[PDB]
Swiss-Prot record, chain B:
This is HTH-type transcriptional regulator QacR. InterPro entries: DNA-bd_HTH_TetR-type_CS (IPR023772), Homeodomain-like_sf (IPR009057), HTH-type_Tx_Regulator (IPR050624), HTH_TetR (IPR001647), Tet_transcr_reg_TetR-rel_C_sf (IPR036271), Tscrpt_reg_QacR_C (IPR013571). The keyword DNA-binding applies. Keywords: DNA-binding, Plasmid, Repressor, Transcription, Transcription regulation. It comes from the Bacteria. GO terms for molecular function: DNA binding; DNA-binding transcription factor activity. It comes from Staphylococcus aureus (strain Mu50 / ATCC 700699). Residues 1-60 form the HTH tetR-type domain.
């Protein structure tokens, strides 16, 4: 079908790189043709998968974040869940590889809002945290970008070692980060 | 020198054309050598590439040995190190062949082993900063090895996932400030 493609494309982009998987591989792997595949281009197809996963993850987060009473806990839990989740973070190396290629100003308007979904989770947390008076952050957008990028760092660059080690580190991080604010 | 020339030539080939594009044939003929010699020294292209990365790690470590004199205190060394890691990758030419390589073999497990030995060397930079910082009462960290792994991966996330260079530096410096503050 049409959305037999998006599922296989996703799995290819994870299995191999952005560059390593091509429009020939995906079309061949879905019993289709370039007529079918023509989405616009590879860059769009990819960027649409990015859209799906980023939503799926933020939705999974919203249906799991009630378990965090304070925002201070929401920070730990969000970063913690990021290690375990099935969404978005498994596409990160392809996202790294993708940035180095496309540069092109046509598509990078779309990178502006998808870079802002990525950080909004923290923005909500730090803003609602200043409303709740758990901390005094004057520079939230700065901090939201930092925390987001740190965490993706730990998730991505530790994807090999034991999952409890990873979860241990990530929690020690959140502890050191939040303590840094006060 | 036929080992070092191969690594030299390999490096520049990898830079110009990328990892996947560079063939051992090229590496062989351009360094005035042979498949035999390349096999004897590196076995694979993958391993050759790792040996390059090894030499690069060493040089980075030698650079940092000299650069860290600009930081009297470890608080300062922490700030600086992270900044260098950010600024130097903005114009690090191998970075593309690395990304290519990393993603091409992070599925593969044997390669994944030796990469650890390599990343571990990069973490030591922080281990030393944090160790020495304990001994001068800059902070009190019980779990140094941990916080060193943490620092390293957080810093490299900020570097890898981010637009004008000043804002980046200002951000990274904020992170260093926040992180370093939350140990008191
Ligand atoms: C004049 C500047 N000189 C250097 C700058 C460098 O910048 C680097 C930036 C990086 N990222 C920024 C996005 C990464 C990942 C590795 C880098 C290395 C590096 C490359 C291969 C193996 C190890 C390292 C290394 O330094 O340690 C990591 C194991 C590196 C090496 C040198 C000599």
């Amino acid at each position: 079908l049409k959305d037999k493609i998006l599922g296989v494309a996703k799995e290819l982009f994870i299995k191999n790189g952005y560059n390593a998987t091509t429009t020939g591989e995906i079309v061949k792997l879905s019993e289709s043709s370039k007529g079918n595949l023509y989405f616009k281009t590879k860059e769009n197809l990819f960027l649409e998968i990015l859209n799906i996963e980023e939503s799926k993850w933020q939705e999974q987060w919203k249906s799991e974040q009630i378990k965090c009473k304070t925002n201070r806990e929401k920070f730990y839990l969000y970063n913690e869940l990021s290690l375990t989740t099935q969404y978005y973070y498994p596409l990160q190396n392809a996202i790294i590889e993708f940035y180095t290629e496309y540069k092109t100003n046509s598509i990078n308007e779309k990178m502006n809002k998808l870079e802002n979904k990525y950080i909004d989770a923290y923005h909500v947390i730090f803003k609602e945290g200043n409303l709740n008076g758990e901390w005094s952050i004057n520079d939230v957008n700065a901090v939201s970008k930092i925390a987001a990028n740190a965490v993706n760092g730990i998730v991505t660059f530790t994807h090999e070692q034991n999952i409890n080690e990873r979860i241990k580190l990530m929690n020690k991080f959140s502890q050191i980060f939040l303590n840094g604010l006060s």
